[PDB]
Design a protein around this ligand. Structure first.
Ligand SMILES: Nc1ncnc2c1ncn2[C@@H]1O[C@H](COP(=O)(O)OP(=O)(O)OP(=O)(O)O)[C@@H](O)[C@H]1O
Ligand SMILES: Nc1ncnc2c1ncn2[C@@H]1O[C@H](COP(=O)(O)OP(=O)(O)O)[C@@H](O)[C@H]1O
Ligand SMILES: Nc1ncnc2c1ncn2[C@@H]1O[C@H](COP(=O)(O)OP(=O)(O)O)[C@@H](O)[C@H]1O
Ligand SMILES: [Mg+2]
Ligand SMILES: [Mg+2]
Lengths: 1285, 198
């Protein structure tokens, strides 16, 4: 019946596939293209999932043939359609540009001819596929794979060859300078599709996300933003005239400015007729607010207030009247916000509250002193707005003014954004930068990170209605790239906000100074068809151009600005903003009865928290943290009021703010600062309390996933309580934050924490979750982010840029999934500072190409790091922090995980191996539970000294490998004795001694003879296990045999006599105690293909012992590698190119040795020696750790994950105390056990070379009586020479 | 290395020991406990490194990379980066730095002895010897605010010549009954400064 059900499932697969045809749609009466990709991809994925599902269990062995045919047919159609979607997508816009664009054959005749050939081939394939829409019929054509690969390669070739036309097309419409080449060809080719253009307006305009169109897509009705706010054109532009794309898009750009000016005039008329009354109607006010856009409403309020103040100062009664009207409007604002509101108009009300409270403060300052004339500098200092309806030019009807600086509103549609709280520091910044802009000099604020530099520059640019662009410039911002973005900015008329400008390679900075000089000279000529020379070309300069420079002097030894460039920028120092004022205004805007009380309680709370708490490298209590707390407090207040309304009202604002503070700051704390912070909360807020939880559903499915993948689980006070609550904290920070960072010592369970959280979120929300793990140090910064070719200006994507671009494009439906990008390395300001504009609220990645990649809301960039000792505050403060303490992952957790993985998942992969695994686990449980023996031995081995820094998890994984070898040996005995299987009592008395032998060689394998003897005698004193009695021989010198007793290694070493032919041959080893012990131990490690490190002094015998071990395993091929000081992972890449080959598979690309069936082992002779960076990292060591833990690496050529198939590592090294050697990272040492091979010593050396000399003095049979004194003299002189020199 | 070992045995006569002194909710008590914890940890690190240099300098012990770097720094007379944790003025020489560290450790020993027996309120502390004085000032303000049940943000400072601070020195001024007079002297040492919050 089960077989019949499976046959019915395959028959249903046959029916659903034979009834499946490609859905072709006509493409404008020229062709018929295939659409509807997502359903096909999902169906193929779920069919392959089902095929793998009944493949595993239970009756797959009877019907293997048709299932194999189905799975490789599905893989083939998956590969074909994976190529096909990209080929069709490229061809659509390539045909669009090559048809609609003229003067192309006059420009690129060979390219046009090649594209006509490509189009003929593609059209022929389309006729062939339209003859038979059946998917198996399309698969039935031979040569489809090679044809599609050739088609894709030639389309990519013409893609790269089409680059010269793009600059010429960009010179027409200025805003095209901010999009990449591929997106620009998408724009040009889809100029008639139009609906495909809606995802590229974001990069081109300020706050424009889409354009409102007609049913026929012939006219552009208006512009909509990301938040749903809409602007409708007064006179719509018509594409039904068939203009060029640049022509109608320029018409759109002009029309939005004209329309915004008209709506601003109407709105300011409305506010003029509103503001004449001492009392206002909230209903009419709210209708006007909902009528006009947020930008225009804030602008109208500012214009009305400025006009009222000027008419009052024209002439204390009028000024008091102005203040009274402002306060009445502010009270109406606060009472309207205090109730529930729709979201967009709630943001509008919040912006108006901020603007009106700033105006109230300004009016109070004016009325506190005595002001009588409009020409007083006290009034002239603040920004003023003047609107004359008599002006016939609608663009220049509003004149923004500050002290001696006349400005025209840019009328760029900004959307909503976030209004900035007008600190007096922000007022001084506004004054200084408007003075610099009046003087035709770029502004340049500086100071410590997190004081409001780039945000204040953006706020000023938004106040003036200008387009501001934030560039996160790094060392790779060259002269040419800077010139390109300057000419783009100058042609558009947009501001420049170059952030972290002082990491810019001083000579290139001095070169940039010339372009900046030319820019301000052109601006001064404008200030009284003007051009300036940039990159040997005279280009138009818009009067709205500005350059702003954000710097952090003394950050990480950044490049000093030259005096030539410093004179072109007006400096302002912002070092401390008014935290009191910003918190008070934000809380009053979010809606809080005791807003001032809460601000006065929260800002000194952070001041005391920065000093009473401990000093750690990952703490931040600055303005960014304070603003995150305030925003989360507003969000949780909204959630609580919605929960109450679901049942005006009264809410515990204090408790809400404490909930937000704990939710944001509790995870970053160490285990010793939790009572201190809770005491601070109890002191500041007396009636505080603290409640958490109510995450029962996700907690239950978290338990389900933990039980699924052999993980332990707790409920707060159980064995897993701390780890589970840390996972919950990580989930909370993913919910409320932007970019995370998980910090803790190696062996804290953070990787398992985020994996289990991702799968629990999968099972809870039903949305697919995909995680990309990137090691930032295993590749250079060029491969991590990108590289600009100096010869031809083309950009090749890096690893992270490629991943983000793939997620943004979402060809395979990656926008709807859950994407997590994990930087599983370590942090230094070389590469993490390129993510300054990503983790900040800018939400974009800036490249030297000038192309910007916004961060989609489903992407959560996150870090998994060990320490933050080499990262700066500018990147510590931007990340939500979770601290995984070392005691989060207790040792009994890992013990239980090992025992569960022993009981399940048999090694040779019910089964005999599974049964013997279960028996071994059940007889070794009492030595693992609680303290037992292993925990005491491990805590003593911590107190011992070792040649490497001993981590718990290194020796613990080593012990697990030894126990797996014990189970394999028992299985070998069972296979060797089929008549008499392994009896349970001698199996018990064998495992009970193998565990002692294995803990000895695990916890004392990387130490000296006296220390391992000390650990042996400690184990003898502490355990109740039968041990071999000997007053002098330690337990380290004993082997446990398959019978169950202790066998000495002295009986294992023979008294061999080597022939005179091979006296000192390289492969000849006279066996001794250390030789056979290390031989057996190395065999134990290599049987499971576990990587290892052979440490010891040079010449001690490490590679000799390794080769003696490898010659006993005939299935392994050794490749020798030598590591110099200047060793880079290109050596491993070249070795993999030589001895291995790359093979494409349905589940990815794998790297395997050419020798089929054999195992390749890579021998690195000087694993310590690769040069350590100034930030304490080694590129080769990080690469090896990446491919040991993750089981593979990233191929640099095409940014594709490569999984090793049959590869393992062995390491040799001198002790880290030696002058040239450096200590390895504990994250790398977590995987590789170390065994310390020392010098043989005099007693062992005597016999080792006595055998050699007794063999060698046989060519002369009259001297054989002198071999012993000859060896004694040799050993004595060697020891004497070793002692002094 | 002979004179290196001579100076290396000269220095630690001013450095002996420090106790770690833990159930108190007083801000001053917990601040002084974490202060003496940091001081004891740094003293243990410095003394262990010093003993290692003694062993590698006069005796039988192999020199590691860390020991070679420390020996080179001590020979050049520049302060090692491992020992420098608190703020030192413009990179002081090791000879004066060890004396300053001895003064700080002796002060923390006096705090430990006073806490061995509120009790910690009556002591007079030099703000120079503390690893962070602004934290002490904020903790003092917190202590008076919690002991009086007063608002933290509305407390001014009254200065006289409930907490005593020693070692404060003026710059071109003199004091008499809390009156400032301009003087030609470079620095006049205030005997004891009295801090009260109102
Ligand atoms: N809740 C748990 N119960 C039992 N074992 C666990 C638990 N969480 C993690 N482990 C075990 O801890 C070991 C190491 O954990 P994990 O892989 O998360 O490393 P990590 O602490 O992130 O280290 P690294 O710093 O090297 O990235 C694994 O072998 C895993 O089986
Ligand atoms: N006057 C202000 N009003 C509101 N928010 C502010 C103000 N000043 C700073 N912030 C917030 O504090 C943070 C400071 O970031 P910022 O210092 O501008 O970054 P950078 O260090 O790159 O200049 C931002 O999140 C900003 O929103
Ligand atoms: N047990 C032994 N029997 C014979 N020769 C040995 C033994 N142990 C070490 N040797 C000698 O030591 C050398 C091996 O040292 P090696 O493994 O190359 O050290 P390293 O790899 O650190 O250079 C060989 O030349 C071998 O003659
Ligand atoms: Mg910035
Ligand atoms: Mg991990």
């Amino acid at each position: 019946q089960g077989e019949m059900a499976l046959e019915e499932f395959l028959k249903q697969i046959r029916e659903v596939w034979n009834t499946y045809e490609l859905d072709l749609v006509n493409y404008q009466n020229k062709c018929r293209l295939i659409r509807g990709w997502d359903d096909l991809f999902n169906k193929v994925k779920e069919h392959i999932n089902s095929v793998s599902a009944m493949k595993l269990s239970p009756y797959y062995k009877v019907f293997e043939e048709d299932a194999l045919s189905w799975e490789d047919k599905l893989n083939r159609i998956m590969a074909l359609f994976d190529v096909w979607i990209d080929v069709q997508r490229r061809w659509v816009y390539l045909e669009g540009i090559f048809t609609g664009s003229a003067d192309i054959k006059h420009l690129l005749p060979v390219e046009t001819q090649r594209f006509q050939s490509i189009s003929t081939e593609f059209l022929a394939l389309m006729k062939k596929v339209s003859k038979s829409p059946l998917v198996m019929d399309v698969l039935n054509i031979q040569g489809v794979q090679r044809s599609l690969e050739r088609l894709a390669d030639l389309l990519g070739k013409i893609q790269k060859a089409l680059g010269e036309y793009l600059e010429r097309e960009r010179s027409s419409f200025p805003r095209f300078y901010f999009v990449g080449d591929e997106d620009l060809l998408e724009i040009i080719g889809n100029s008639k599709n139009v609906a495909k253009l809606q995802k590229h307006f974001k990069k081109m305009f300020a706050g424009v996300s889409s354009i409102i169109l007609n049913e026929d897509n012939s006219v552009v009705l208006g512009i909509s933003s990301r938040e749903g706010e809409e602007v409708m054109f007064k006179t719509p532009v018509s594409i039904t005239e068939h203009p060029k794309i640049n022509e109608w898009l320029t018409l759109v750009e002009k029309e939005m400015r004209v329309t915004l000016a008209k709506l601003l005039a109407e709105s300011v008329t409305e506010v003029e007729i509103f503001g004449k009354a001492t009392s206002i109607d909230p209903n009419t006010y709210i209708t006007w607010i909902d009528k006009y856009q947020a930008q225009l409403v804030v602008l109208s309020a500012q214009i009305a207030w400025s006009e009222n103040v000027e008419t009052a100062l024209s002439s204390a009664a009028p000024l008091h009247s102005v203040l009274s009207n402002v306060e009445v409007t502010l009270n109406v604002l606060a009472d309207s916000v205090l109730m529930e509101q729709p979201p967009l108009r709630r943001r509008k009300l919040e912006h108006l509250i901020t603007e009106l409270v700033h105006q109230r403060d300004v009016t109070r300052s004016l009325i506190k002193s005595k002001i009588d004339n409009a020409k007083s500098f006290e009034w002239l200092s603040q920004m003023r707005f003047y609107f004359d309806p008599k002006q016939t030019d609608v663009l220049q009807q509003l004149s923004i003014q500050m002290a001696n600086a006349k400005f025209n509103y840019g009328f760029e549609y900004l959307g909503v954004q976030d209004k900035l709280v007008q600190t007096p520091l922000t007022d001084r910044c506004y004054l200084t930068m408007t003075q610099a802009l009046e003087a035709r000099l770029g502004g340049s604020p500086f100071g410590p990170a997190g004081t409001g530099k780039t945000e204040s520059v953006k706020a000023l640019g938004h106040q003036l209605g200008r387009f501001v662009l934030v560039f996160n410039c790094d060392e790779t911002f060259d002269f040419q790239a800077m010139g390109r973005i300057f000419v783009g900015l100058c042609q558009v008329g947009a501001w420049g906000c170059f952030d972290e400008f002082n990491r810019l390679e001083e000579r290139m900075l001095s070169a940039v100074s010339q372009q900046v000089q030319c820019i301000q000279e052109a601006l001064r000529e404008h200030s009284n068809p003007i051009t300036c020379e940039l990159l040997n070309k005279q280009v138009k300069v818009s009067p709205d151009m500005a350059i702003f420079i954000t710097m952090n002097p003394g950050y990480a030894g950044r490049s000093n600005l030259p005096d030539n460039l410093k004179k072109l920028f007006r400096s302002l120092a912002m070092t401390k903003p008014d935290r009191q004022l910003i918190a008070q205004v934000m809380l009053y805007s979010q809606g809080f009865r005791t807003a001032e009380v809460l601000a006065n309680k929260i800002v000194p709370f952070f001041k005391l928290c920065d000093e009473q708490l401990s000093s750690q490298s990952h703490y931040d209590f600055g303005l960014r943290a304070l603003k995150s707390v305030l925003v989360s407090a507003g969000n949780v207040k909204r959630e609580r009021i919605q929960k109450i309304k679901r049942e005006a009202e009264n809410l515990p604002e204090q408790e809400i703010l404490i909930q937000s503070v704990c939710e944001t700051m509790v995870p970053k704390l160490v285990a010793e600062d939790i009572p201190l912070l809770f005491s601070l909360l109890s002191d500041v807020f007396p009636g505080v309390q603290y409640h958490r939880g109510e995450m029962t559903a996700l907690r239950e499915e978290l338990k389900k996933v933990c039980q699924e993948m052999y993980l332990t689980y707790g409920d707060g006070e159980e064995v897993g309580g701390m780890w589970v609550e840390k996972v919950l904290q990580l989930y909370q920070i993913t919910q409320i934050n932007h970019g995370l960072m998980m910090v803790g010592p190696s062996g804290s369970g953070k990787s398992m924490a985020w994996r289990v959280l991702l799968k629990a979120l999968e099972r809870l929300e039903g949305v697919e979750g995909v995680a990309h793990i990137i090691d930032p140090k295993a590749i250079s910064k060029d491969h991590l982010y990108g590289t600009l070719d100096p010869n031809t200006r083309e950009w090749t994507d890096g690893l992270f840029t490629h991943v983000l671009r793939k997620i943004i494009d979402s060809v395979r439906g990656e926008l709807q999934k859950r994407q997590w990008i994990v930087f599983d390395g370590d942090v230094d300001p070389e590469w993490v500072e390129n993510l300054n504009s990503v983790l900040d609220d800018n939400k974009l990645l800036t490249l030297p190409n000038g192309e910007r990649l916004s961060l989609p809301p489903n992407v959560r960039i996150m870090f998994e790091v060990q320490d933050l000792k080499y990262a700066t505050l500018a990147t510590v403060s931007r990340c939500g922090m979770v601290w995984f303490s070392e005691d989060v992952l207790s040792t009994d957790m890992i013990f239980n995980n090992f025992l569960a993985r022993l009981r399940s998942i048999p090694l040779d992969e019910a089964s005999p191996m599974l049964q013997i695994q279960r028996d071994a686990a059940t007889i070794m449980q009492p030595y693992f539970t609680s303290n037992g023996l292993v925990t005491k031995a491990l805590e003593h081995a911590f107190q011992l000294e070792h040649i490497m820094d001993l981590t718990r998890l290194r020796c613990l994984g080593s012990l697990f490998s030894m126990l797996h070898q014990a189970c394999r040996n028992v299985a070998q005995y069972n296979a060797n004795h089929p008549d008499f299987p392994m009896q349970i009592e001698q199996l018990e008395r064998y495992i009970q001694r193998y565990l002692v032998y294995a803990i000895l060689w695990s916890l004392s394998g990387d130490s000296r003879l006296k220390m391992r003897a000390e650990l042996g005698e400690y184990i003898r004193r502490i355990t109740t296990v039968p041990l071999p009695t000997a007053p002098n021989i330690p337990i380290i010198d004993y082997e446990v045999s398959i019978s169950g007793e202790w066998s000495p290694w002295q009986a294992k070493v023979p008294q061999i006599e080597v022939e005179t032919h091979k006296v000192a041959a390289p492969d000849v080893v006279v066996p001794t105690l250390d030789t056979v012990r290390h031989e057996a131990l190395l065999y134990t490690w290599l049987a499971e293909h576990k990587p290892l490190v052979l440490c010891g002094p040079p010449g001690s015998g490490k590679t000799m012992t390794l080769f003696s071990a490898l010659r006993a395993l005939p299935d392994m091929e050794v490749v020798g590698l030598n590591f110099s000081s200047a060793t880079t992972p290109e050596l491993l890449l070249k070795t993999f190119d030589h001895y291995c080959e790359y093979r494409r598979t349905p589940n990815g690309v794998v790297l395997a040795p050419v020798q089929l069936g054999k195992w390749l082992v890579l021998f690195c002779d000087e694993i310590n020696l690769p040069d350590m960076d100034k930030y304490g990292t080694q590129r080769v060591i990080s690469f090896i750790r990446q491919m040991v833990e993750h089981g593979g690496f990233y191929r640099t050529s095409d940014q594709t994950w490569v999984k090793l198939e049959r590869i393992q590592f062995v390491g040799a090294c001198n002790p880290p105390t030696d002058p040239g050697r450096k200590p390895l990272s504990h994250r790398f040492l977590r995987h590789v056990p170390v065994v310390y091979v020392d010098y043989p010593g005099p007693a062992s050396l005597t016999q080792i070379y006595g055998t050699f000399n007794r063999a060698m003095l046989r060519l002369i049979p009259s001297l054989r009586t002198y071999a012993e004194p000859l060896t004694a003299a040799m050993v004595e002189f060697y020891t004497m020479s070793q002692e002094r020199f | 290395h002979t004179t290196a070992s001579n100076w290396l045995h000269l220095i630690p006569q001013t450095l002996s020991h420090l106790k770690r002194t833990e159930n108190i909710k007083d801000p001053l008590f917990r601040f002084f406990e974490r202060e003496v914890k940091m001081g004891a940890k740094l003293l243990q690190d410095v003394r262990q490194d010093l003993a290692d240099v003694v062993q590698v300098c006069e005796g039988k012990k192999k020199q590691t990379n860390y020991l070679r770097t420390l020996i080179n720094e001590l020979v050049k007379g520049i302060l090692p980066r491992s020992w420098s944790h608190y703020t030192v003025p413009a990179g002081m020489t090791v000879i004066q730095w060890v004396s300053d560290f001895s003064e700080r450790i002796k002060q923390l020993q006096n705090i430990s002895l006073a806490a061995a027996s509120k009790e910690l309120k009556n002591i007079h502390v030099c703000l120079g010897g503390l690893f962070v004085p602004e934290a002490y000032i904020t903790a003092t303000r917190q202590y008076v605010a919690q002991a009086n049940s007063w608002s933290l943000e509305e407390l001014c400072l009254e200065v006289n010549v409930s907490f005593g601070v020693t070692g404060l020195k003026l710059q071109g001024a003199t004091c008499n009954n809390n009156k400032l007079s301009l003087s030609n002297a470079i620095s006049t040492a205030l005997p004891l400064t009295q801090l009260r919050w109102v």
